[PDB]
Write a protein that binds this DNA or RNA. Sequence first.
RNA 1: AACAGUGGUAGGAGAGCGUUCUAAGGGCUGUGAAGCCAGACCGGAAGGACUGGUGGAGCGCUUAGAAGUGAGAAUGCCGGU
RNA 2: UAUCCUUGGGAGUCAGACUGCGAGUGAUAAGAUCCGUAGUCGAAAGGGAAACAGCCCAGACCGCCAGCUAAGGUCCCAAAG
RNA 3: GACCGAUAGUGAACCAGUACCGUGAGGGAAAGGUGAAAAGCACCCCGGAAGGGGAGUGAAAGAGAUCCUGAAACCGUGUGCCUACAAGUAGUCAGAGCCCGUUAACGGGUGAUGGCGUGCCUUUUGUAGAAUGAACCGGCGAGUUACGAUCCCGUGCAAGGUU
Lengths: 49, 143, 112, 117, 102
Amino acid sequence: MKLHELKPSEGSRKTRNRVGRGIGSGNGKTAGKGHKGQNARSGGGVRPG
Amino acid sequence: MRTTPMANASTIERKWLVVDAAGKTLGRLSSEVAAILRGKHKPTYTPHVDTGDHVIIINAEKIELTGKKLTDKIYYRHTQHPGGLKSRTALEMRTNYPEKMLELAIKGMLPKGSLGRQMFKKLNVYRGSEHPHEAQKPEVYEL
Amino acid sequence: MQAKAVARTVRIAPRKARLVMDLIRGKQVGEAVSILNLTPRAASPIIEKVLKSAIANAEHNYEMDANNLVISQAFVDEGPTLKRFRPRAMGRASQINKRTSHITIVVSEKKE
Amino acid sequence: PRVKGGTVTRKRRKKVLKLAKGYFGSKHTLYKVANQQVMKSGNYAFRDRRQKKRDFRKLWITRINAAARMNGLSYSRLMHGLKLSGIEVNRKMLADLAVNDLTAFNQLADAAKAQLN
Amino acid sequence: MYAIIKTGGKQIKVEEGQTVYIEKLAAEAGETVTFEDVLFVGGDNVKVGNPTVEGATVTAKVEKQGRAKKITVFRYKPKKNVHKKQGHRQPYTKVTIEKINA
RNA sequence: AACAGUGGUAGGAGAGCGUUCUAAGGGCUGUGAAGCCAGACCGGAAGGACUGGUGGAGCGCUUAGAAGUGAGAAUGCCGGU
RNA sequence: UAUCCUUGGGAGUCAGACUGCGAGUGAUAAGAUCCGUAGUCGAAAGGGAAACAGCCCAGACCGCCAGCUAAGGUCCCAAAG
RNA sequence: GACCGAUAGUGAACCAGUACCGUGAGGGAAAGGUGAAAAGCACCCCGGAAGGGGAGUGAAAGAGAUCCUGAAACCGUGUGCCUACAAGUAGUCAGAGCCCGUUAACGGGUGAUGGCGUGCCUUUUGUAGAAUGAACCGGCGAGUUACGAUCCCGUGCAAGGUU
């Protein structure tokens, strides 16, 4: 309804974005990190590919 | 809570005690003396900061460690002398320079670094078999 | 009551200049001026003259008296390293500097 | 919309240097060095927090031991008679009272004689 | 009268007119708590040495709840990137004795 | 209430805090806004705000949505030293 | 009973390390070189072994100037017959 | 324009394709602010000369000619505490003296010396290191958006939905 109560019902409040800004509050420190010797690289920074 | 009583004040005033050393071993004796030099002879805050008390050996020329125990005594220092590591024994301290056995055996039982060397100063060795330290009122005591 | 002073456009390093400034402190103007005047360097008569002229003004306009004044405080503080070229060899392009200083001085009356 | 994240930097950096009070040297005047000391301070803190409680125990035991010798007994048989009587243990902290108060010291000696080696 | 009483896991020395810092209790302000767990008397009395004496009963007048100031605890794990922090402050009580009833 | 507790990397799962912005219900300001600097700031678990001084013309809480979104190190980048 | 069973949605990991127990390699020596078992560490502080994550003590989000054991002691200092 | 706001953005916010560099094709910078209004310092004093030093200006002169707000590094100045027999990757924790004086917890300051001790990021099982980068401080800057696909979860119909 109202413009001061836009309030999505989870049609855009489903949300939750995985962290990466944190250094280890949640999961991970930065993108492209794991525990392998191929980390901190643009290519080979993926496990699954 | 974490409130706590103390008993440091009562027992520390830099009092003066004598301890016999005339015909005495000054090894097994010295151990009990060391306790009192750090300040501890009654309830006292003493594993941590506090000034000690004066305890004075009365003699230094009749220190015999008795039997074979004497001969194989260990002493060390590591100086800026060209030989570095000097090692000596009670037996040869008895054969001239008799003052040094009582000194390094009571310094050793007080180290903490800075504060340890303070407590050491309150020791006077003498050698006349009497004290001229009657000016500070000593009395016989052991732990 | 108090007189300010500053010097501009001189050759002297800050580190160097701090010495003379702090040393003239607690001392009369009449003594301080004399010192600076006969201190060696070409900047000497310049830093002297400006400091001296600050005194002059102080009397006529702000009702102070030269003879009575001492030096409350003075100091010299780090400023920019002034690159004015001097050759430095090995084919290299570098300057040995000719720095300038920011001289702060607070004169004042000891007797009003 | 966008945001620099750049107004934020002076807030984060300034705080570290301003939380260092009573620190020594030039390690609290330089940002990148001050950081490393925050890590130190927290690690040290927690270890010593627990260590200290053992050090106070290794202080009280000493006090008792000294008092005990002057009753003709020693700490082993002193503490034994205290605990076996029931109370008169009085922790170890509060048994510093054997210097200060004579009346207390007498009772802790009576309690000692009750059960001995 | 001289007395010593139990404050949970610890003990405190207590006379007939002294404030004492104690553990947290629900009570505050002007309330009344009692310490009939008085387990030593000895300063003008004699005890040896059943737990608790019935010749004394310390009585306390609860005098406000204060707090022990916040003290940041922290464990850094270097090159493992953990930085879990915690702070202890918490409420605590203070009580004032003024009478050790017989 | 009573019972029990184990809170750490790769990750999974759960909440929140700051920063800029647009939105509609609202409110301060030159009688001093935003900002600058200190403070023993009451209140956090942590990320986090309520006071005084300076300052000199505009500012933002809630309810929601957005992103170059919180630094620092990259033989990183620009300035001062 | 954070015991098993089944399906769906995201994993990460191929370089582990050291010790006790048991087999093989060796010049039958070498945290040497290969592993079955258990363990710790990796991925948890901390306790003891003078000075050591890996044996031995134990799994601690956080405070207590409280008491009890282990390892380790009681003559003193870096506590105690 | 649910674009950017002075180290961000066009190479270029400004007397910039300038300055500067290459014989040449061509590469290529840094730089905003006194006020609403110049009323931009009358009046005065001193210096060889640059400048200032008092005073006035005007609401405001930390608005006085790098003049807005003006930090931090850097370099000084005043003050409270503290040490001339002491051992240290610099803190942590305990007492203790002296000093000071909280808005509220009824409060703040220091180090005399005890106990205790492996830089940040790497690279890994593990670097505190004598393999890595970083003199220092400030700013600046990377988990961004779209379109297929598959689950999620919020909705519409309900054997029909859908342009």
